[PDB]
Amino acid sequence: QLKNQIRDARKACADATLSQITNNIDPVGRIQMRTRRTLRGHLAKIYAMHWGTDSRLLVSASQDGKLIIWDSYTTNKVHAIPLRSSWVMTCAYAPSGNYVACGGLDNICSIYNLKTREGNVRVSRELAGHTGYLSCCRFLDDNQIVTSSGDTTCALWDIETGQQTTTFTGHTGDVMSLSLAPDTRLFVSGACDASAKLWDVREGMCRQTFTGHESDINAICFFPNGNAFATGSDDATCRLFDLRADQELMTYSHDNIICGITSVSFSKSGRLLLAGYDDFNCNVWDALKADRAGVLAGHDNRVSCLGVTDDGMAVATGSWDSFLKIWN
Amino acid sequence: QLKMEANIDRIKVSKAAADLMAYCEAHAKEDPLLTPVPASENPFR
Amino acid sequence: TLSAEDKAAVERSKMIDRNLREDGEKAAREVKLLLLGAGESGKNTIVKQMKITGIVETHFTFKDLHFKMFDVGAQRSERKKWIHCFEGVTAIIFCVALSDYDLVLNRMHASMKLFDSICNNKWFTDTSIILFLNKKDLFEEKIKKSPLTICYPEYAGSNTYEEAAAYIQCQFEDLNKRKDTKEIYTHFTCSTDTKNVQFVFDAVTDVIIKNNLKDCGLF
Amino acid sequence: YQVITSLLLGTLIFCAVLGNACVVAAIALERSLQNVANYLIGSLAVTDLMVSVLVLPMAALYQVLNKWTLGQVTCDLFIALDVLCCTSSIWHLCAIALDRYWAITDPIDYVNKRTPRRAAALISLTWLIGFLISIPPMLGDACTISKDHGYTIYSTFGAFYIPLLLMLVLYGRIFRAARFRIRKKNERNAEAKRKMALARERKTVKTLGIIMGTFILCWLPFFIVALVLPFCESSCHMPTLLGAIINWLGYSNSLLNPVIYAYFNKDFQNAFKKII
Ligand SMILES: C/C=C\C/C=C\C/C=C/C/C=C/CCCC(=O)O[C@H](COC(=O)CCCCCCCCCCCCC)COP(=O)(O)O[C@H]1[C@H](O)[C@@H](O)[C@H](OP(=O)(O)O)[C@@H](O)[C@H]1O
Ligand SMILES: CC(C)CCC[C@@H](C)[C@H]1CC[C@H]2[C@@H]3CC=C4C[C@@H](O)CC[C@]4(C)[C@H]3CC[C@]12C
Ligand SMILES: CC(C)CCC[C@@H](C)[C@H]1CC[C@H]2[C@@H]3CC=C4C[C@@H](O)CC[C@]4(C)[C@H]3CC[C@]12C
Ligand SMILES: CC(C)CCC[C@@H](C)[C@H]1CC[C@H]2[C@@H]3CC=C4C[C@@H](O)CC[C@]4(C)[C@H]3CC[C@]12C
Ligand SMILES: CC(C)CCC[C@@H](C)[C@H]1CC[C@H]2[C@@H]3CC=C4C[C@@H](O)CC[C@]4(C)[C@H]3CC[C@]12C
Ligand SMILES: NCCc1c[nH]c2ccc(O)cc12
C-alpha cells in the first residue's frame, strides 16, 4: 500500500519533463576530442581509475597486481604499489593524497600510505570484515572510508581503529557501484535489483527508493550540483534520477546500441556527461537534450572506467587493453 | 521506515528541472570540455 | 627542457617501468587454472590431495611447471559479475561427486545445470574443461543399496557399476553444445594421489600443444 | 615488346612492395601482434621488402635492356646484395620452421622461456649466414654471378640444400606429432569423431602441402639450374625464356611468402580489418 502511495504521489508530481524546458536550448553540437596523451605501463586489464584533488595525479588499478600513480602532465610514474591479491575490482584516491585504497574479489579494502618518512610505500591498514567480493570502497575524509560489498551490504570504516562503525542492509542483489557526494554528507548505492538506495552517513539508514531499470545497474555518478545522479544499466538505457524530484526524468537510449554500460561520469558544470559502453566506444551524451554529441575511439576490447578531473581540465578513460587515454 | 520517509518537503519537478538548467548555464563558461580550449593555455600541449 | 628535476623524474619513471616489466615477465611464465564445483563435492579433498576469505590462491610445481589454482567456491555470489575476470585461463577443473543421490539440498541436477551454464559461457568458448569424479567407492555402495531410477526417470537398465559410470560420463559429456572448439577431459578420482596431478599436467600439456597447433593451422 | 614485359615487371614489384609494406606496418602498429613468431614474420617481411626495393628493380632493368649499362662497380653491389638478401629470406623459412617445431614439441619451453631474444638471435644468425655467403666472392657486358665450381657448390649447399633438408625433417616431425595428437548414442559419437578426425587430417595435410610445395616449386628449379649449368661447359644452349622464367620465380616468391605466412592466418587478417 505504501509503495502504491509513493508511486501515485510521484506520478502526480510528474507534471512536465526536462525535454520541454530544454527544447528551446540550443544543442551543444559536435564535440571533437582526440587522444592527446597515451599511458602504457600496465600489462593486463584495468577496471578502476580515480582522479586526484589537484587534477594532476590519478590512480589506476590493474589485474597484474600493480597500481600506478601517473602524472597527467609529463606522463611519468611517481609510484608503483604491488598488490598481495592480483584480483582488484576498484580503487580510490584520498582527498589529501596521503592514502590509497584497493579492493577486489578478496573481502578486503586495503589502505596504502604514499607519504612517509621512510619514503617507501607500505601497507597502512587491512579492513577485513566483509563476507563477499568488494565492489567500491571510497574515501570520505582522511579518517573515514565507505565500502561496497558483493553480499548486499555497505559499511562505514574508521581507518585507525579498523572496525566498522555503521552497516547497511536491505539489498537482495549485490551492489555494484558507489558514489560520494561533493560534501561527503550522503551517498547513493546501486544493486542488481534494478534499484538504487540513498544512504545517509551521519545517521546510517536508508532514505528513499529509485526504480525503473529492467536489468542490473553497473555505475552511478552524482551530478555536480549534488541533487541528482545518473544510473547506467546493462539494457543500454541510462537513467537520470534527481534527489529532489525523487523520480525518473529522462532516458538515454538509442537503437544502435544493444550492449550495456560500465562507467558513467559528469562534467564540472554537469552540462555534458560521459558513458563507457562495451563497444570500445565512449559516448558524450548531452545532459539536457539527451542526444549524442561526441564519439571517442581508440580502445580494442572494452572500456572499463572513466573519470573527469575536479577542475574539468580533461577526462581520462580506461580499457581492457592496459591503455589509458586522456581526452580533452 | 517509510512512515518518516513519506513526510518530506515536496517541490515541483519542474522546479527541479529549472534549477538544473540554471546550474548548467551558470558554470558553462568554466567548462574546458564544452568549449575547445586552444593550445595556448591548454597544459596538455 | 634543461631541468634537473625533469631528468630525475624521467629516471624514476624508467626505473619503475623496468621493475614493472621484469615483474610482469616473471609472472607471465606461470599457468593459471580455475577450480569450480559444489561446496562439498570433494573440492577441498582434491586441493589437499594435490598439495600432499575469498579467492584461495595455491601454487604448484610439477615437472618444471608452475600452476595457479583459484578456488572461487569459498565465497558464493552471482557468477555473472565475477566469472568474466577469469578469461584466458588454460583450463577449468570441475569437481562433482558420484555419490550425490542420497544427499538432497536434486543435487545431481543442480550440478549438471551449473556445469552446463559454466561450460556454455561466452568467456569460456576456447577454455578447456577438466572434469573430476570423486568418491567412486561410496557411489558403488549407494548403487548396490539404491536403484538408479530415482535420479533418472528417463533411464532404465541394469544396476551395474561400469555401465552406470559410463552412462554418467557420457551424459556429462553430452551437456556441451560446442565440441570442435573445446574438449572435455573426464577422470576417475580414487585413493591414489599422483594420478590426479599427472592427469592434470597431461591435460594442460595437451591443451597447450593443441593451441600451438591451432595457431600453426595444423589442428 | 619491351613495354609489354616492363609493365608486368612493374606490377610484380609494385604488388610485392605493397604486400611487404602492409605486413610490416600492420605488425608495427598492432600491440596484439607482438609475438615471438610474429617477430620472425616481420623480419621476413622486411627482408622481402629490401629484396623488392633494392634488387628487383635493377634485375628488371637488366632483363628489359638485356645488358648491364651501370658498370662493374654497380654489378658487384647488385650481385652481393642479391645473394645476401635472397639467402637471408630463404633462411627465415627454416628459422620459422624451427620455432614452430620448438613451440609444438616443447610446450614446457614455450611456457617457461620463450622471449623476443630468441627471435632476435635467430634473425641475427640468418643475417650472419647471408653475409657469409655474400662476402667471400668479393674477398676472393653481362652481370653474371661467379660460376666457380667450389664456390657454386658451397653457396648452393649453404643457401638451399642444407635448409631444404633441415626444413623437410622439421615439418615431418611436426606432421608426425600432429597426427599423434589428432588420432589420440554410439552412432552420434562415432560419426562426430570420424568427421572431426577426417577434417583435421585434411586441414593439416593441406596446410603442410601448400607450405612445402610453394617453396619447392618456386626455388628448387633455380638452384638445380645454378648447380647444373656451371658444371657443363660443353652444353650451354638452353632456351633463354626457360632460364629467365626460372630466375624470376625466385624473385616472384617475394610476394608469395607473406601470403603463405602472414595473410592466410585468421589473426593477421583480423588485425587488417581492425586497422582498416
Ligand atoms: C588439382 C586440384 C587440387 C589442387 C588445388 C585445388 C584444391 C586445393 C586448393 C589449394 C588452395 C589454393 C590457394 C588457396 C589457399 C586458401 O584456401 O587459403 C585459405 C583461405 O584464404 C583465402 O582463400 C582467402 C584469400 C586471402 C588472400 C589474402 C588477401 C591478399 C592477397 C593479395 C596479396 C598481395 C597484395 C598485398 C587459408 O589458408 P589455408 O587454406 O592454406 O589454411 C592455413 C594456411 O595454409 C596457413 O598458411 C595458415 O597459417 P600458416 O601455417 O603459418 O601458413 C593457416 O592459418 C591457414 O590459413
Ligand atoms: C632501404 C629501403 C629498403 C627502405 C627500408 C627502410 C626500413 C628499414 C624502415 C621502414 C619502416 C621502419 C620500421 C617501421 C616501424 C618499426 C616498428 C618499431 O617498433 C621498431 C622499428 C621499426 C621496425 C622500423 C625500423 C626501420 C624500418 C623497417
Ligand atoms: C621489443 C624488442 C625486443 C623487439 C625486437 C626487434 C629486433 C630484435 C629486430 C626487429 C628487426 C630486426 C632488424 C631488421 C633488419 C636489420 C638490418 C641488417 O642489416 C642487420 C640486422 C637488423 C638490424 C635486424 C636485427 C634485429 C631486429 C632489430
Ligand atoms: C610455385 C608457385 C608460383 C605456385 C604454387 C602452386 C601450389 C598452390 C600447388 C602445387 C602443388 C599443389 C598441392 C599438391 C597436393 C596437395 C595435397 C592434397 O591433399 C591437397 C592439396 C595440395 C596441398 C595441393 C595444393 C596446391 C599446390 C600446393
Ligand atoms: C604466380 C605469379 C604470382 C608469380 C609468377 C609470374 C611469372 C610467370 C611472370 C613474372 C615476370 C614474367 C617474366 C618477366 C620478363 C620475361 C623476359 C622475356 O624475355 C620473356 C618473358 C619473361 C620470362 C616473363 C614471363 C612470365 C613471368 C616469369
Ligand atoms: N636471387 C637468387 C640469388 C642467389 C641466392 N643464393 C644463391 C646461391 C648460388 C647462386 O648462383 C645464386 C644465388
User: Measured from the CB, is residue D218 less than 6 Å from ligand 4?
Assistant: yes
Residue C65 DSSP one-character state: -
Residue A102 to residue A83: CA distance in whole angstroms? 9
Residue C57 forms beta bridges with which residues?
C70
Distance CA D186, CA C178 (A): 18
How many folded domains does chain D comprise?
Answer: 1
D253 is in an annotated binding site: no
Cα dihedral C177, C183, C186, C187, rounded to 10, equals -170
Taking the Cβ of residue A250 and every Cβ of chain B, the question of whether any pair is shorter than 8 Å is answered with no
CA distance A38 to A75: 8
3-state secondary structure chain A: CHHHHHHHHHHHHCCCCHHHHHCCCCCCCCCCCCCCEEECCCCCCEEEEEECCCCCEEEEEECCCEEEEEECCCCCEEEEEECCCCCCCEEEECCCCCEEEEECCCCCEEEEECCCCCCCCEEEEEECCCCCCEEEEEECCCCEEEEEECCCEEEEEECCCCCEEEEEECCCCCEEEEEECCCCCEEEEEECCCEEEEEECCCCEEEEEEECCCCCEEEEEECCCCCEEEEEECCCCEEEEECCCCCEEEEECCCCCCCCEEEEEECCCCCEEEEEECCCCEEEEECCCCCEEEEECCCCCCEEEEEECCCCCCEEEEECCCCEEEEC
- φ/ψ region of C4 (left if φ > 0, alpha if ψ in -120 to 50, else beta) reads alpha
Q: Domain map of chain B by residue range? A: 1-45
Which CATH number, 3.40.50.300, 2.30.40.10, 3.30.930.10, 3.30.450.20, labels domain C31-212? 3.40.50.300
The answer to whether A42 faces chain D, any CB pair under 8 Å, is no
Cα dist from A324 to A38, A46, A297, C63, D110, whole Å: 6, 9, 12, 39, 30
Q: Do A86 and C57 touch (CB under 8 A)?
A: yes
Q: Which of D92, D117, D91 is nearest to D42 (CA)?
A: D92
- Residues C180 and D196 sit within 8 Å (Cβ to Cβ): yes
Distance CA D211, CA D203 (A): 12
Determine the distance in angstroms separating the CA of A199 from the nearest CA of chain B, rounded to an integer: 12
Q: Tell me if D262 sits within 8 A of D191, measured CB to CB.
A: no
Alpha carbon separation from A325 to A43, A55, A70, A311, C193 (Å, rounded): 15, 15, 12, 18, 50
Q: Which ligand is nearest to the CA of D56?
A: 6
How far is it, in rounded angstroms, from Cα C201 to Cα C94?
Answer: 15
Contact yes or no for A86/A106 (Cβ under 8 A): no
- What one-character DSSP code corresponds to residue D192? H
Here the cell at position D183 is 588420432
Atom 13, ligand 6: which residue's CA is nearest?
D83
Enumerate residues 6+ apart whose C-beta is below 8 A from D122: D40, D95, D98, D99
Residue C16's alpha-carbon distances to A78, C13, C202, D24, D115, in angstroms, are 8, 5, 38, 30, 21
Is the Cβ pair C212, D182 closer than 8 Å?
Answer: no
Strands A228-233 and C184-188: unpaired
Query: In angstroms, how far is the first alpha carbon of chain C from the final one?
Result: 55
A43 vs D contacts (CB less than 8 Å): none
* Ligand 1 lining (C-beta closer than 6 Å): C 216-217; D 15, 18-19, 22, 206-207, 210-211, 255, 259-261, 263-265
Grid cell for residue A43: 600489462
**And the C-alpha cell for D90?**
630463404
Separation CA A228–CA C175 (nearest Å): 48
Cβ pair A232, A207 in contact under 8 A: no
Any chain C CB within 8 A of the CB of A126? no
- Beta-bridged to residue A91, according to DSSP, are A102
DSSP per-residue codes, D61-84: HHHHHSS--SHHHHHHHHHHHHHH
Residue C2: is it exposed, middle or buried by C-beta count within 10 angstroms (0-12/13-18/19+)? exposed
At C101, which amino acid appears? Y
Distance from CA of A321 to the nearest CA of D (A): 9
Strand order, beta sheet including A186-191: A175-180, A186-191, A195-200, A205-211
Which grid coordinates are listed for D169? 625433417
Helix, strand, coil percentages for chain D (3-state, nearest 5): 85, 0, 15
At residue C61, φ and ψ (nearest 5 deg) are -140, 110
Q: Is D248 in the pocket of ligand 5 (CB under 6 A)?
A: yes
**Neighbour count for residue A281 (Cβ, 10 Å):** 17
Residues C172, C188 contacting (CB under 8 angstroms): no
Which technique? cryo-EM
End-to-end CA distance of chain B: 54
Helix (H, G, I), strand (E, B) or coil at D181: helix
* Ligand 6 cavity residues, CB under 6 Å: D 82-83, 86-87, 145, 155-156, 159, 226, 250
Contact D141, D118 (CB under 8 A): no
Ligand 3 atom nearest the C-alpha of D120 is: 8
Q: What is the resolution of this structure in A?
A: 3.0
List chains adjacent to chain A, taking adjacency as at least 3 C-beta pairs closer than 8 Å. B, C, D
Gap between the Cα atoms of C46 and C35, Å rounded: 10
Is A176 close to C6, i.e. CB distance below 8 A? no
D46 lines ligand 3 (CB under 6 A): yes
Whole-Å CA distances, B10 to A223, A231, B18? 20, 23, 15
Which helix (H) or strand (E) segment holds residue C21: the answer is helix C4-28
Question: Measuring CA to CA, how many Å separate C129 from each of C90, C91, C186, D37, D90?
Answer: 9, 6, 9, 27, 41
Distance, in Å, from the CA atom of D202 to the CA atom of D208, rounded to the nearest integer, reads 10
Give the C-alpha separation, D253 to D90, whole Å: 10
Contacts of C9 in chain A (CB under 8 A): 71, 74, 76, 78
Tell me the C-alpha distance between C92 and A214, whole Å.
32
Look up cell 585507525; give the residue. Answer: A160
Q: What residue numbers bound the domain in which D27 lies?
A: 1-276
Helix (H, G, I), strand (E, B) or coil at C36: strand
With a CB-CB cutoff of 8 Å, which residues 3-22 of chain A face chain B?
A: 5-6, 9, 13-18, 21-22
Going by the DSSP 8-state scheme, the letter that residue C103 receives in this structure is -
| Closest ligand relative to D222 C-alpha | 6
The count of C-alpha atoms lying within 13 angstroms of the C-alpha of A23, restricted to the half-sphere facing its C-beta, is 5
Nearest neighbour of C17 by CB, restricted to A41, A74, A131: A41
Query: CA D256, CA D217: separation in Å to the nearest integer?
Result: 12
Distance D49 CA to ligand 4 centre (A): 25
Indicate which of A105, A151, A192, A278 best probes the interface with C, i.e. most C CBs within 10 Å of its own CB: A105
- Angstrom distances, CA of residue B29 to CA of A127, A296, C33, D205: 43, 23, 54, 69
* For ligand 3, mutation pick of D24, D30, D40, D43 (most atoms within 8 Å of CB): D43
Reported as type and span, the H/E element at residue C128 is: strand C128-134
Task: Among D31, D34, D270, pick the best mutation site for testing chain A contact (most A Cβ within 10 A).
Answer: D31
Strand partners, C193: none
- C25: which chain D residues are within 8 Å (Cβ-Cβ)? 115
- Cell match 609489354: residue? D4
Residues 6+ apart with CB under 8 A from D158: D87, D129, D132, D133
Q: How many Cα atoms are found within 13 Å in the side-chain-facing hemisphere of A264?
A: 32
CA distances from C86 to B1, C34, C164, D226 (A): 41, 8, 34, 57
* Phi, psi angle pair for D210, to nearest 5°: -60, -50
DSSP string, C202-219: HHHHHHHHHHHHHHHT--
CA dist B37 → B31, B33, C115 (Å): 9, 8, 55
Q: Give which of A166, A232, A167, A165 is closest to A196, Cα–Cα.
A: A232
User: Distance between CA atoms of A223 and D52, rounded to whole angstroms?
Assistant: 60
Question: What CA–CA distance (Å, rounded) separates A140 from A163?
Answer: 16
Which residues, 6+ apart, have CB-to-CB distance to A250 below 8 Å? A17, A18, A19, A239, A240, A290
Of D142, D143, D123, residue with least CA distance to D131: D123
CA distances from C218 to A237, D19, D172, D207 (A): 45, 25, 12, 7
Distances in whole angstroms, Cα of residue C183 to Cα of each of A225, C204, C206:
55, 12, 10
- 3-state DSSP call for residue D159? helix
Say if residue D86 is exposed, middle or buried (CB neighbours under 10 Å; 0-12, 13-18, 19+). buried
Atom of ligand 2 nearest to the CA of D28: 17
Name A93's bridge partners.
Answer: A100
Unique residue bearing C-alpha cell 626457360: D242
Domains and CATH numbers, chain A: 1-327 (2.130.10.10)
What is the CB-side half-sphere exposure of residue D191 using CA atoms within 13 A?
4
The reply to whether C6 touches chain A by the CB within 8 Å rule is yes
C150 contacts C113 by C-beta, under 8 angstroms: no
In angstroms, the CA C195 to CA C62 distance is: 13
C-alpha cell at A325: 587515454
CA of D54 to the centre of ligand 4 (A): 30
Kindly compute the dihedral angle of the four CA atoms of residues C164, C169, C172, C178, in this order, to the nearest 10 degrees: -140
Q: How many other CB atoms sit within 10 Å of the CB of residue D4?
A: 7
Chains D and C touch, using 3 or more CB pairs below 8 Å: yes
Cβ atoms of A30 and A6 within 8 Å: the answer is no
Interior angle at CA D125, CA D119 and CA D126, nearest 5: 90
Quick count: other Cβ atoms within 10 Å of Cβ D259? 12
